[PDB]
Each structure stands twice: as C-alpha cells, then as structure tokens.
C-alpha cells in the first residue's frame, strides 16, 4: 500500500506519485481530495498546483480554479504555474468586453513578479503580440499602442533570459517598422544596455542549467547536498552583481529573486532562510548610508517577512528561525512583536519549550528589566512542559546579573526541589554552589544531594565525581579515601575490578593522565 | 633482519627467538652478549633466565652461573628456575665435606619460596630422599633423621599440590615402616588435614591448568584478556580462602603467591600490581583488628615494597604506581619518603613532568603547609620540561585553599606571560577570572587575550566562544552581535557559509539547542 510507505516516511515521493497516478483514473470529486492532500504536503510545489489546477480547470470549475490560483500563484514563483495563470485569464476573460483592460494587468502583474525568471521569455511575447494586436483607430490611438509595445520591448532587452536575443531582435525590426530613419538611432541608444543584459543573460544562462527548480522540497535527511551546492552558486553569483550597475536595489531584487527560487525546492533548510534575510537586513542598512532612507526602510520591514514567512509555511516548529526573528525584531527595537513572537511558539502544543522559556527570559531580562523577566520566568514554572534547565538559567540570572545570591540559592533550592532526580541539574546546581568558592556549604550539598536519597544512585556517578574533585581540591588524602570508599560502595556493582581505571581519576587533571593511551586502554579506561 | 623487527616492535618475540636460535650457533662468549639483552628485556622470564644458566653452566663456568642466580633466584619465582638451582648445588656442592649441611638449606629455601608452586612435588621428594639417604649411626642419630624427614612429610601432606596423593601415600608407608603400632595413629591424627588439602590441591589443580606461566611479560598493545581472565579468577579463589581455614596469614600468604606468579607474565599490567598492593593493605589493618600486630606491620611494610618493585622494575616510567606510592607512603604518614618516591620520578630524564609537578604540589600544600607547596611549585617552574598546567593548578590552589585573588592573579599573570600563547592555558585563565563574576574585569582579560596578539587568532575560537558565552550570560543583544562579528571576521576563511550553523550556539545551553539532531546534521553543525 503506498498510504504504508507514507506512514514511514510522509514525504515518500514514491508514494505521491502513485496517489497522483490514480489522481487522474478518478473524476475531479475524488482526486480533489489526493490534490489537497499533496499541495499540503508540498506547498511549495508550482508543478503539483498545476496538477490541481489543470484537473479542476479540465472539469469547468472555473470557480474552484481561481479559488486556487488565490491560494498558491502569490506564493510560489514557479514559472509555469505563473504562464497558467496566463493562459486560464487568456480563455475565460477572453469574451468579457473588459477583457484588453484585465488581460493587460495580468500581464503586468506576471512580468512584475515572474519576468526575471530565467525561463520567461514567452509571458513577454505574448504580451507584445496581444499589444500590437490591440485595435487602434485614428493616430493618437496608435501611436499610443507604439508607447506601450515599444515600453514592453525596451524593458525586456534589458531583462536576463533565455531568448533575449530574439527579443531585441524583434526590437529592431519594430522600430523598422515604423520609422527606418528614427530607427537607427531609437535601436543604437539602447544598445549598449542590451549587451550588458544579452551578456548577464548568458552568464544566468549558465548558473541555471545545473539547477532542477521542480523537486519537491523534503527536509533533510547525495544529490540534495550537490543541487544546494548549485543553489548558493547562483545566490552567490547574484550578489556579485552580474550587471555590472551601480544600482543596489536592482541587485538587492536579482538576489532576493534568486533566494526566493531556491526556496521553493530547498525551503526546509533552515539557514537558506536565515541567510536569506540577512542579505536583506544588510542591503538595507547599506541604504541607510548612502542616504537612500525610504527605499531602505522597505527591505528592513521586509526583511522580518522572510521570518514569518519561513516560520509560518515551510518551517512552523523551528526554535532557530523563531530566536532570528525574535532577535531581529528586538534589534529593532520592536520589543512588542518580539514578546509576540515567542509566545507564537510556545503557542504550539508539542514543542520542548524549556530553551524557549530560556531565550524568552533572556531578551526579557536584558531589554525589560528584571522584573519582566520574573514574569516569563513565572509562566516558565507554569508550563508543565518546561524541563529542569530554566530553572538553572533562571538561578544563574540573578547570580549574573542582579550579585543576588539570595533569588539565586532559592531557585535552585526551588528548583532542587522539584528537579532533584535530575542528575544533570542536581550538577548544575552543585557547579554552581562550588565557584562561590565556600568549602563548608559545598559539602553540605555534597552529602545532601547523596543521602537525600532523592536521586537514585544508579544516576549518581557524576556527582561522586565532582565530589572527589571537590575533595581534591581542598580537603585531603584521607577525606579523599573516604569519597572514595562510598562512591565505591554505591557502585560496588559495576565498579568491582575496575578499581585502577578507576584510580586514573584521583590523579589526572586536564588533558594529563598518570598513563599512556595504550596503558588506560587495557585498564578499561572511560574518560567523562 | 630479525634486529630489525626489534627496531620496529622491542618485544617481537619472533625476533628474539631467532636471536635466540642462533644463540646456540655460537660459543657462549657471544652468546652471552645476546643473553644478556634478553633477561635485560624479560626480567621476569626464569624461561630466558634458565636459557643463560644452562648455556653458562653447559661451558663448565660455575662461577658466572652463581652470579646469574644471585641475580634472578630472589627475583623470578618460576618453578624451573628454582629446581636448576637446586640441580646446580646437588652438583657443584655434591664434594663438599658440608655438602649435606649445604644441601638441606638449598632445600629449606626452595620449598620456603616456591614450595607453594602447584608443580613443586618433586622438590619435595627430592629432599625426604636426600634425607631419608643421610647416614646415622647409633640411634639418636636415626631417630634424629626420622624427626626430619617426618617433618618435610607433614609439611608436604598440607601443602595443595599435583601429587599431593602419591606424598601421603609414602608418608603412610614411611610411618609403618618404623612402627606399624604407632603408625595407625600417627597417620590419623593429621589426616583430617591432608583430606581438606588434597581437596584444595583439586581446587587449586584446576584454576591452573588454563594458565600460561611461561609467556614473556609484554606491555598491553585477544588472548592475553582472556588469559588476563583466568589470572584474576586464580588469584580471587585464592582471596576466598580455598583452604576453609582461620589463619589469615596462610591466606595473605597464598593469595600474595597468586599475584607474584602472574605478575611474571602480566607485570606489565599497572592494575595489578595495585591491585596486590591494595590487598596488602587490607590484610594489614585487618590484622591490626584482631589484635595481631607484629604480623600486621609486616604486611604494611610489605605492601610499600609491592610498590617499589613495581615501580623499579618493569614499569619504571609509570606515574600511575608512582603516584599511588607517594600516595601510600603519605598515608602511612611518612612524609619524608613520598618526598623521595616523587622526586625520583621526577628524577628521570623523559617524562611530561607536568602532572608529577601537580601531584607533588598538591600532596605538599595539603600535607606540609602553604610554604612546603610553594617549594615545589618554584622547582616546577625551574624544571624546562614543566608545561602551563602547573601555574593553572597552582594558581587556582591559591583561590582554592588560602582564598587569596592577588598570588592567584599573580600566579596567572606570571602564566599568562610565559604560557600566552597556548589557547588551553588562556581559557583556563578566563574560566577563573569569569567565576569570580566580575562582568568588567572578565571583559577586560576577553579583549587583551584576543588583541594582544599573543595568542594567533586561528587557534583562539574557543575564545570568541566564552567571550559570546560571557556576552549572552550579561551583556546584550547589540554587544553579541559586535563579539560575534568580530569573531566572523577572525575566521572570515573558515566560517564562510557556516553563518547558520555558527548562530545555533547564539541559543543553545547545555543538552539544548533550537534544532533537531537531523536538522543540525545538514546545517554542518559541529559541537565543542
């Protein structure tokens, strides 16, 4: 069954594949409900919309259809899924006597989003033809459509892509066409542009032709690592500024096009997306330099839509995109959405909160004030989620911070309480009470930790460890047997025979050893 | 070249066989030479030993032989050594007017030191024969005989051995022969005790019978664990009391046995001879219990030499014995020898010092006083070899012990200076100085050990690290971004592209971080 195979790995293209076979051996009432199911799993998938698209498009649901395109065509650059777009407002606009008025904008609203792909040639062609063919009557009216097929054609051959040279081509011969004289000089005015762009697109031409731009995008678990290898390339070769031009927006705009293409089959890694809004973070103060202020403050707030896009689509568990964002917008000073943005994630019902809680507390702290952070720190032990470690983090806080080690002792001790079978904090704890440097209390905890019974042996070795090393540093010889001695009798089990590995521990320090590799090898030798 | 192998690995024992082959190609004027440079590699092999002896003993020069025993017979308790020597007295002394005189104490001081050896029998026989032989005229002289050989009889039908039957069957014999009256009780009186020994001799048969006892002692580089095994079990059965017996001395005695005769093929095992040691001690003070003191301050003063031995003869390099010497010396509160066992250890030409140093310092504060410490610590310094961790441990003993932050800060600072180039030593410096929980000062040591350019930048990430660490525990948001920025530009080579998996430790504490183990796999995550 391929619904088994989804049930191990859900992202099994294998699977979808066989879903999608049958999708069509089945009328559109039925597969709708395969099609949801795929677009769901891969958003981002312009070639499984079109799936979807093209079926309900095939039964004359023309509701249904732009129903989807409003669902998808905004957010996913794919360039077919855009050309389809084209042609579904091509027929079922066709006849509306609105139609020049509509079929135009879409044309527009095409080129302005999608004209930069690679592959677009066409969309601007197509948009030409339909110009020229646009009836005019009288002289003011055609040479009014010569501004606006003249407009299309003067702003593609300066547009990277596949046939921009068929493009300028027809160019020539427009002009030509209407005025051989003029036509020298209308061509050689805009050429030298031209060849920057007929150049960049071949040098595009090249940077593309490795990349796929239809896998489905997977999170990672060959080729993957060898096509992102391609992606960055492409990214990279974007950021360099291919056209040679000392506008930065338009170089800002090629690399953001690129990111945003590469997302759409690399969308679940969480570092295209963080790199992806830095580049913008930076192209954005760069501007803020140069004195380029509104123009700026666009990709600054546009920037912070790169996270809530990622950690809102593709990527909606990811305590990594969620801090990047909280910290961008606590860079910005936007201390509101910050608090918004972590309590987002903890919103979610399965997640381990406790490094939330942790991160949350700590930008509270450091741009609120001590008490703001006692509040988070409040719904922390409020979250029967939250693990050990906040407390800890917490109790350190005030050591750090406040010089308190008043709320300190008492979070811990707070904390000791509800955590104290929890080798790693009981540690963490004793760490702690142990650089105060008090000789007396240490071993308090020492020999409370250890007979509070509290924690069960089995899971104690660390600490008699760090109490030996506690009663080697201060304390002696014989006070060192006696630990030992105990920690021995704790674990008279598996410590029997192995009383010399054993013994490497009351001597080395660092990086020392009283023995060779070799020697600490056949002693059977474990090094913490 | 069979010196080749040698060159390669000192212990080839195929080497030495060949060496050895042609040992005997040769008169033993060159052969010599190479014997030498045997038992000077396998000390404890009475194998070798025997081979020198009897190629010395073949050319007639008795006088060479004598010296060959003086200097392995004490030292290499294997039961071949041990009856050629008594071969070479039975000969050598055979003429002598005080032959018999001579003779009975070769015997006495065989069956004293080996007689325990499970394959001692003969020697025994040997010496009821040669007694048995001894002339006696008159009748205070035969009964005088007789009072002899029954006591060699007696001692030998308790003593756990192969034939241990085929001896208490002549002694039976020997009794009737002189009065077949007297003789029935004679022989039930001890029988009870030769039952419980020729039991035991059964037990002992057996634990034996897996052991080599022959293979040449080697360091530890399949079947030497497995033999390693079977030594341990030998030795434990003798620590369980076999013999079901009160007398702990006889105990002691036979599990002391055990681990001389492994040591002779495992001495190269610092476990064990701790471990022999260890139960030297023990038997020791659980003899000072039972009200048994002069007994008890033999095995107390013996276990030191278990230690001597070991560190004086197959492992003369070992810190680990060494250390566990001083140790035992220190607890035995004879402060003046640990002086020495450390400073011979120090004595020697190649060793990383370092540690010894540490020990010494360490075993000197605790037990002499502040000043005593600082002795060593000055000859620490002085002593070319020593490496940085010494003024980290002395350093810290200052804080630690006296609670001193000025010979502390000094003693790291007069380390920092000379030592300021190794990123270890520069970290344990920061790791103190930031417990101290001075925000400032901390900040202050970060930037010199990161601009004084002492430390070269490529090996200072660890660095860069605490430093961001310190940053995110105080400090703020703007202050990370300018650490960590810095940090980028450092390493501006190697952590090109790595952006993503570099922010992960902007957020992860302890066994957290905001990714999953598969998503931190694709970032390139690497954690220190």
């Known amino acids: 069954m ?30 709708r409900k395969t099609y949801e199911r795929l677009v769901a799993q891969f958003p981002s998938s312009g070639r499984f919309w079109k799936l979807y698209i093209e079926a309900e498009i095939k039964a004359k649901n023309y509701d249904k259809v732009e129903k989807l ?46 004209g930069m ?26 040479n009014q459509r010569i501004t606006a097929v003249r407009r299309v054609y003067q702003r593609g051959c300066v547009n990277p892509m596949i046939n921009i040279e068929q493009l300028w081509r027809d160019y020539n011969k427009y002009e030509e066409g209407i005025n051989i004289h003029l036509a020298k ?25 490795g990349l796929d731009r239809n896998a489905p995008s997977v999170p990672p678990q060959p080729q993957e690592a060898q096509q992102v290898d391609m992606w960055k390339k492409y990214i990279q070769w974007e950021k360099s500024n291919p056209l040679r031009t000392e506008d930065q927006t338009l170089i800002t705009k090629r690399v953001m096009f690129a990111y945003e293409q590469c997302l759409l089959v690399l969308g679940h890694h969480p570092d ?10 930076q192209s954005s103060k760069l501007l803020a330099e140069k004195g380029d202020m509104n123009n700026a403050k666009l990709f600054s707030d546009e920037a912070a839509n790169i996270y809530e ?36 994630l903890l919103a979610i019902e399965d997640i381990d909160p406790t490094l939330v809680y942790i991160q949350y507390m700590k930008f509270a702290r450091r741009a609120e004030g001590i008490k703001s952070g006692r509040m988070i720190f409040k719904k ?52 702690y009470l142990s650089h105060l440097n008090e000789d007396n209390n240490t071993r308090v905890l020492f020999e409370r930790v250890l007979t509070s019974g509290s924690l069960p042996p089995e899971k104690s070795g660390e600490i008699w460890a760090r109490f030996l ?60």
């Open 2 to 31: 391929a619904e088994k195979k989804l049930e191990e790995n859900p992202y099994d293209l294998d699977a979808w594949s066989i879903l999608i076979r049958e999708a069509q051996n089945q009328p559109i009432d039925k597969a």
């Open 69 to 114: 395109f409003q669902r998808c065509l905004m957010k996913v650059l794919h360039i077919d899924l855009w050309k389809c777009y084209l042609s579904y407002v091509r027929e079922t606009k066709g006849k509306l006597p609105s139609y020049k008025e509509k079929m135009a904008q879409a044309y527009d609203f095409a080129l302005d989003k999608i």
């Open 117 to 142: 792909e690679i592959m677009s040639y066409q969309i601007w062609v197509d948009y030409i033809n339909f110009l020229k063919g646009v009836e005019a009557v009288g002289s003011y009216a055609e």
């Open 185 to 209: 000089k209308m061509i050689e005015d805009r050429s030298r542009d031209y060849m920057n762009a007929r150049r960049v697109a071949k040098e595009y031409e090249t940077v593309m032709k």
């Open 272 to 281: 295209i997306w963080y790199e992806a809004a830095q580049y913008l973070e």
């Open 309 to 344: 896009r990622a950690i809102s689509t593709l990527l909606k568990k990811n305590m990594l995109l969620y801090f990047a964002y909280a910290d961008y917008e606590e860079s910005r000073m936007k201390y509101e959405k910050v608090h918004s943005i972590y309590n987002r």
């Open 380 to 431: 922390a032990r409020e979250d029967a989620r939250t693990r050990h470690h906040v407390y800890v983090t917490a109790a350190l806080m005030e050591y750090y911070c406040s010089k308190d080690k008043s709320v300190a002792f008492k979070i811990f001790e707070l904390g000791l309480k509800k955590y104290g079978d929890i080798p790693e904090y009981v540690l963490a704890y004793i760490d």
């Open 469 to 528: 090393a506690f009663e080697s540093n201060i304390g002696d010889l014989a006070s060192i047997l006696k630990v030992e001695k105990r920690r021995f009798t704790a674990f008279r089990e598996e410590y029997e025979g192995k009383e010399t590995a054993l013994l490497v521990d009351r001597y080395k320090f660092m990086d020392l050893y009283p023995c060779s590799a070799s020697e600490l090898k056949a002693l059977g030798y474990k090094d913490v």
